[PDB]
From a paper:
The protein crystallized with two independent dimers in the asymmetric unit, resulting in pseudosymmetry. Additionally, Thr188, Gly189, Thr191 and Ser275 all form hydrogen bonds to the ligand. In the active site of subunit A, additional density to the [name] was present. This density is fitted by O-acetyl-l-serine, an essential substrate of the cysteine-synthesis reaction. Lys52 and Asn83 both form hydrogen bonds to [name]. The reactive N atom of the [name] is 5.7 Å from the O atom of [name] that together form the Schiff base. Small molecules were found to be bound at the dimer interface of both TcCS dimers. Based on the unbiased electron density, ribose was identified in the AB interface, whereas glycerol was found in the CD dimer. The presence of these two molecules suggests that a hydrophilic pocket is formed at the dimer interface. In the presence of [name] this loop shows increased flexibility.
The de novo pathway of cysteine biosynthesis requires the conversion of O-acetyl-l-serine into l-cysteine, which is catalysed by [name] (CS). As CS is not found in humans, it constitutes a potential drug target. Crystal structures of the three enzymes were determined at resolutions of 1.80 Å for TcCS, 1.75 Å for LiCS and 2.75 Å for TthCS. These three homodimeric structures show the same overall fold and demonstrate that the active-site geometry is conserved, supporting a common reaction mechanism.
Residue numbers in the entry:
A (entry chain A): 17 to 232, 248 to 344
B (entry chain B): 18 to 326, 338 to 344
Write the structure that this text describes.
């Protein structure tokens, strides 16, 4: 509705989306143009802000939830939980996040910082244990709702309505290729739906881990008919790319950003892609992953640094 | 350019023009409180602007030469991160000097952006880091100190960008501006801009009750990372400031812990201090119906491993 550069936003959820895009510069040694959609710039530092926004906005417009009455419940340890907790507290909903006790204490802490009730389930039960706990909570409290049921309904839709149109505007209607990893499938499905709807013939590439190539579970949100090709990227390739992006381009992202950019660079090296514009997504900001395997090699390096003697000063 | 409608040339082109948000649930006063969200900069702090200014203005003055100059600073704080970030983008070597006792996470972040990290013995404190910087600049003809506490570029960037942004966002309704003083660049530059447009806003500096040097007190250790350097920075212009508000560590922390739940604001210690101060000012009868602007300097995620959830100058 408003330019955030020129106005005061009514609340933090009003600053979700309309994220910037940037050219890949130093790392792009190819003949193609690579455009990064910076979902890492959302208020809670990931693409999942848009999904959480959709859930609260659309469910309330359909009368499925009421602030101060409905309780939003989800099994997650990821950015979706953070974003649900964030928007929930702003809008005055109780939020219950269920996750195994074996997940990172940092992720646990982030949910609690936004006042979510965090229900921890035994490590020995895994994600199944968290899903079972959610089922019990939702079934037994008439005012509890499952976020996942709304996420499934609204996920691709929000990307068709926001992410896609933004990309189209930012590139001035120039997209030859779109590359994105599949988590929930929302981003790739909603963007590809949008691009099809505006008559854009862009080729659509899904990215998945070589170590878990299930697209090659399949989320209900994901629409395989919109995808032209699957690129598999190894953990090592994703990590190497994410470790280099800060130095080459000042881009600080997670594992998925590394995978997406690696995939884009592989596509860009194809002769037929010369001079084409390839768009991909940086899903999340890197700082959330500082304690993970993504940056552990750098952590080991700085841990071992020598200290100057007083005599060398 | 409008970022909503164009592709940026580089990440340093997305610095500044940050959003602003009303403080709503936490604000029980008769004043309007506007938060300038410096936490939304690309490297998640106000220091992106200072780093941008240093590289942009130093190059325009010929004080750095691309592919020759090496940028040096003694810092484990946001200034070092931002210097390393813009340095690597522009192709400058960056050397960050810090006491060995500063956070390993901050050390790691400098190195992620390709800065060289020099560690100084903790028994020498910040003096030891400053001495190492002086040795680098004296002995290395190509080395240039960022000089964050004294450089003219600091207040200048805030006079040119942060101030005009606040003026535009509030549509010329700024009755009060409240900001914690680290380098003093933000408050000085914003106050300079507001003065230049004939705005009679009252200007409030915030400092730790534990280290109230702007108030004429003694330096001391405190938890409010980003502010309270333990001396009066050269950048800071006391003549522009109407009052200094002291905030305790406990008050700053309490506020920063509540802001995420009340208003979805996820910030560090200094954002808590600023908001606490703004709310204290806002209770004054003369502030009824007035617009008070303060700053959220940095995003909260950088503080997850800290106490939030002297060495003070090194945390800037
Ligand atoms: C959500 C997410 C993705 C995938 O986006 P989808 O819309 O779920 O397909 C991958 N990376 C990160 C870090 C994200 O949070
Ligand atoms: C730099 C810093 C400030 C203070 O800003 P100055 O312009 O240096 O006075 C406050 N808090 C944080 C987190 C900082 O990094
Ligand atoms: C990877 C991420 O942060 O998101 C994944 C998803 N939000 C989950 O519940 O795991
Ligand atoms: O890039 C600046 C950081 O704070 C902002 O909120 C972004 O989401 C990101 O995590």
């Amino acid at each position: 509705e408003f330019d955030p550069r020129n106005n005061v936003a009514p609340s933090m959820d009003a600053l979700i989306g309309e994220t910037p895009a940037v050219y890949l510069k130093r790392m792009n040694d190819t003949a193609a143009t690579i455009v990064l959609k910076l979902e890492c710039e959302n208020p809670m530092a990931s693409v999942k802000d848009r999904l959480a926004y959709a859930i609260y906005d659309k469910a309330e417009k359909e009368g499925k939830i009421i602030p101060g009455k409905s309780v939003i419940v989800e099994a997650t340890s990821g950015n979706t939980g953070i974003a649900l907790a964030h928007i929930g507290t702003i809008r005055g909903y109780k939020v219950i996040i269920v996750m195994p006790e074996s997940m990172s204490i940092e992720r646990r802490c982030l949910m609690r910082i936004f006042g979510a009730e965090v229900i921890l389930t035994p490590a020995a039960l895994g994600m199944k244990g968290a899903l079972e706990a959610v089922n019990r909570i939702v079934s037994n409290n008439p005012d509890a709702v499952s976020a996942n049921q709304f996420a499934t309904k609204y996920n691709a839709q929000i990307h068709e309505e926001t992410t896609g149109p933004e990309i189209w505007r930012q590139t001035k209607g120039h997209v030859d290729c779109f590359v994105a990893g599949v988590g929930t499938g929302g981003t790739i499905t909603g963007v590809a739906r949008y691009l099809k709807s505006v008559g854009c013939g862009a080729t659509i590439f899904a990215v998945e881990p070589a170590e878990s190539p299930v697209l090659s579970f399949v989320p209900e949100v994901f629409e395989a008919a919109l995808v032209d090709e699957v690129i598999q990227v190894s953990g090592d390739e994703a990590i190497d790319t994410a470790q280099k992006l800060p130095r080459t381009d000042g881009i600080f992202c997670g594992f998925s950003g590394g995978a997406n950019v690696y995939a884009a660079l592989q596509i860009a090296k194809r002769p037929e892609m010369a001079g084409k514009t390839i768009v991909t997504v940086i899903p999340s900001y890197g700082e959330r992953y500082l304690s993970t395997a993504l940056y552990s090699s750098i952590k080991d390096e700085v841990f071992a640094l020598k200290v100057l003697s007083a005599a060398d000063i």
